[PDB]
Design an enzyme around this catalytic site. Structure first.
Site, short mmCIF file in Angstrom:
data_model
loop_
_atom_site.label_atom_id
_atom_site.label_comp_id
_atom_site.label_asym_id
_atom_site.label_seq_id
_atom_site.Cartn_x
_atom_site.Cartn_y
_atom_site.Cartn_z
CG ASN A 259 73.57 52.64 63.87
OD1 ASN A 259 73.16 53.59 63.19
ND2 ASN A 259 74.14 52.82 65.06
CG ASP B 157 75.72 55.61 61.31
OD1 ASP B 157 75.90 56.18 60.20
OD2 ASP B 157 75.06 56.13 62.25
#
Ligand SMILES: Nc1ncnc2c1ncn2[C@@H]1O[C@H](COP(=O)(O)OP(=O)(O)NP(=O)(O)O)[C@@H](O)[C@H]1O
Ligand SMILES: O=C(Nc1nccs1)[C@@H](c1ccccc1)N1C(=O)c2ccccc2C1=O
Ligand SMILES: [Mg+2]
Length: 283
Positions: free
Chosen positions: A139, A152
């Site tokens: 991420n 995210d």
């Protein structure tokens, strides 16, 4: 009001990029109404099927509202049976794959700087009172090799802090744990955390005091910071603001805090970024 709401007909899925926990992420093309251009985008179709939630949109209005070089912003949302989130397409992908893909071609300046950057992003989210709940190298996206961004925010047992497992408690100090795993990932060049231990047994090896090991390239200064990120008493963990200073200090003398073979032939150049920044990252 910073969240464009798209119609279904002005963008199309073009290539699957991968799925994960919450959704599937495609390479899409935005076609502005009236226009004959196709602008690329990243779409994340959820895995559920929204039914007049509300909840989501009220959160997407926050995600879409994070101005910081190092944290990624939701750009728009198309509310469809399956809701679609649209954000800036990052061709390099995420830092996980990138470190994997470049196992033996990453100096110490890069790694130490990525660590600097993820901290700065995280620190901004902290200051914005948001908990990431899912910080991991997969991420962190690569805008250009010199600029990484967290995506995210808003069950990765192997990245969660003990208290988020035992008691579903996600405070900022637990994101500092995940930060600790993420750096570990970076320095281990994409290794998998606790590779061998079922993800039902982490809460026990952690309570025995077991922790990821010192990556080869890591020194005692770079591995002791990590360890602190993984301490039981949550408050005994470094604040994000103190990891910027520490990692920034180490980034100023990297071949001293990271010991990499041939580190002598692998570094950051002003001409090569002035070319990168016009073609991709125009901060
Ligand atoms: N904005 C983006 N631009 C380019 N690639 C992206 C973008 N967002 C995600 N991707 C890529 O698509 C993959 C799948 O997305 P996603 O399922 O959300 O990430 P994930 O980390 O693997 N799942 P998660 O554990 O929930 O965060 C990611 O690992 C990235 O490599
Ligand atoms: O969509 C998301 N990431 C994407 N990857 C590929 C294309 S979009 C992320 C996200 C993106 C950027 C910054 C923060 C978070 N996100 C949201 O904003 C969101 C709002 C409401 C429900 C669920 C979500 C969600 O999962
Ligand atoms: Mg993701």
């Amino acid at each position: 009001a910073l969240l464009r709401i798209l119609k279904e007909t002005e963008f199309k899925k073009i290539k699957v990029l991968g799925s994960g926990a919450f959704g599937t992420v495609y390479k899409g093309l935005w076609i502005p109404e009236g226009e004959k251009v196709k602008i690329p985008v990243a779409i994340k179709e959820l895995r559920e099927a929204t039914s007049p939630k509300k909840e989501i949109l009220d959160e997407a209005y926050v995600m879409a509202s994070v101005d910081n070089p190092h944290v990624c912003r939701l750009l728009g949302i198309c509310l469809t049976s399956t809701v679609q989130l649209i954000m800036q397409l990052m061709p390099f992908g995420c830092l996980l794959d990138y470190v994997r893909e470049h196992k033996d071609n990453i100096g110490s300046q890069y790694l130490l700087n990525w660590c600097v950057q993820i901290a700065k992003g995280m620190n901004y989210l902290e200051d914005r009172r948001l908990v990431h709940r899912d910080l991991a190298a997969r991420n962190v996206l690569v805008k250009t090799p010199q600029h990484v961004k967290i995506t995210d925010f808003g069950v990765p047992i192997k990245w969660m802090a003990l208290e988020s497992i035992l008691h579903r408690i996600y405070t900022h100090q637990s994101d500092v744990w995940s930060y600790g795993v993420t750096v570990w990932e970076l320095m281990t060049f994409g290794s998998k955390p606790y590779d061998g231990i079922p993800a039902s047994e982490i809460s026990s090896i952690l309570e025995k005091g077991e922790r990821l090991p010192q990556p080869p390239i890591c020194t005692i200064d770079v591995y002791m910071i990590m360890r602190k990120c993984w301490m039981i008493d949550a408050d005994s963990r470094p604040k994000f603001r103190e990891l910027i200073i520490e990692f920034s200090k180490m980034a100023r003398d990297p071949q001293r805090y990271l010991v990499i073979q041939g580190d002598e032939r692998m570094h950051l150049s002003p001409t090569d970024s002035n070319f990168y920044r016009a073609l991709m990252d125009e901060e």
